[PDB]
Design a protein around this ligand. Structure first.
Ligand code: 7F2
Ligand code: 7F2
Lengths: 293, 293
């Protein structure tokens, strides 16, 4: 079965990687581009970008381990462990050529280690709307003069005794609508129909638990990246961030400059966290232009 | 009936203040000391200190509006609004003499405006384990290298859509036990019987909602206090804080130095947030000595 509608001309398929069955959607022809979603969503967040990219590229959009239709990881949920799965998957389809990478939210966490460790395999890189795990995340405020902060969910999802799963189970549709809309500027794009689709996917018990395990490994990922970041990224990079409610603002580019030699950044006004949905036309344009250079 | 056992020589009673029926427990003879509890708790957190204070003082311990057995406020939940109820309650019993005040956690938020605006009515002040609402609270971290932070609950409780009430309902005992123990050093002082009593009290639907309305009014309290704090406190003040896991550490006294001219502070090693329960005997001694000078 398919949790989300596959775009015309794409195929939904599975690939076993180190004992873990990963789900992905694939289409197009040409050089490979891999698009990696973040928390609360699946490959489907890319569904409007994929048909345009597939006119010039082979496009693959996997579900992160444990999320969507992908099995949970067998090693662990830290960035370095999950990146092995995604690197091996990409290299199944591009064993002889570098590929491009686009990543959003915790897709950044789950790709940065494989990018920095296999720089010859990455031709171009686009990161949007999340910090790379490092000590900077310990400086975000718990509470702001406007109200709730952007990243208090880090502590909620990381808390022990399965606090988040115990409270959210049975209320997944309510919680996801609140979480998505509270991080959005253009809230109107999140129709009840679309919210139903995303909520049914992450309400699967192992997907709800997998969602929070990424955050429970966040401190480990910070410790891993403290070693890995001793080597800067050499390939062309682009960051995107929302400028509106829920957006990372100038932080996205300012952090990336410590990681990358060659980086350009954009802040999209009137857009929050969910750039592919809130600001599809300018985001799609920026990504397609950058990868087509 | 009574939500909590009343100590011998004390009475459980009610007074109407500005149309709001407030519950309190009262005992002893002599000058008045009012004890103001915080989140997750009721007057009962003072039940070990009260019989000792009652040997030299009249002791009153109210339930905050909307919590325990007290009615919700009819004005609002900001500190300046709640402080009116507590000030008028204390003046019913000590109209002709200044009274002492001891407050814990959000009891601080709900008493500081009354103290700074009615300094002649306050003889001595003890504050423990929470910031006065001001801009300093915007510097607390959302997440730490050890896991969840101390005050991410500020954003969780202040979120709209009744987020906290909706996620916690049906799981009130579970959530309160996790909250108490995650801010404690000494968890064994919380028997199943005591947790059951506190969980049953704040699980009342209007008390569960009242608990979080104090946080939804927190930024309004910060703005109110920005004007109030132009007047420094002049009465003898003491701060107490835990030095262990869950404790405020040195922050409590360092903040109070900006508000008060005559302040002494203590940090209790081995103690977390719940000083009257985790560290009853030394906390009791320090309060009694300070008030008895
Ligand atoms: C995905 C990472 O947790 C959600 C990030 C929230 C956006 C904050 C700017
Ligand atoms: C009462 C105020 O929200 C609980 C505060 C605990 C913060 C210090 C650990």
């Amino acid at each position: 079965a398919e949790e989300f509608p596959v775009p015309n001309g794409f195929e939904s398929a599975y690939r076993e990687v180190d004992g873990v069955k990963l789900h992905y959607v694939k289409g197009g022809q040409g050089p490979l581009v891999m698009l990696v979603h973040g928390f609360g969503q699946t490959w489907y967040e890319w569904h409007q970008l994929m048909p345009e990219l597939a006119k010039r590229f082979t496009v693959i959009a996997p579900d992160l381990p444990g999320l969507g239709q992908s099995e949970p990881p067998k090693t662990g949920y830290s960035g370095e462990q999950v990146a092995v799965y995604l690197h091996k998957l990409a290299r199944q389809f591009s064993p002889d050529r570098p590929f491009d990478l686009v990543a959003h939210d915790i897709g950044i966490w789950n790709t940065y280690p494989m990018v920095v460790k296999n720089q010859a395999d990455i031709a171009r890189l686009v990161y949007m709307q999340a910090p790379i795990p490092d000590a900077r995340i310990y400086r975000f405020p718990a509470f702001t003069a406007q109200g709730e902060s952007l990243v208090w969910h880090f502590s909620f999802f990381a808390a022990d005794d399965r606090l988040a799963e115990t409270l959210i189970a049975g209320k997944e549709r309510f919680f996801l609508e609140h979480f998505i809309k509270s991080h959005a500027s253009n809230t109107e794009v999140f129709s009840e129909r679309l919210l139903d689709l995303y909520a049914r996917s992450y309400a699967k018990p192992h997907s709800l638990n997998a969602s929070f395990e990424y955050y429970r490994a966040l401190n480990e990922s910070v410790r891993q990246n403290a070693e890995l970041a001793k080597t800067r990224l050499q390939m062309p990079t682009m960051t995107l961030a929302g400028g509106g409610h829920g957006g990372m603002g100038t932080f996205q580019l300012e952090q990336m400059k410590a990681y990358a030699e060659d980086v350009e950044g954009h802040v999209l006004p009137g857009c929050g966290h969910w750039l592919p949905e809130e600001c599809a036309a300018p985001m799609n344009r920026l990504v397609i232009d950058f990868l087509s250079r």
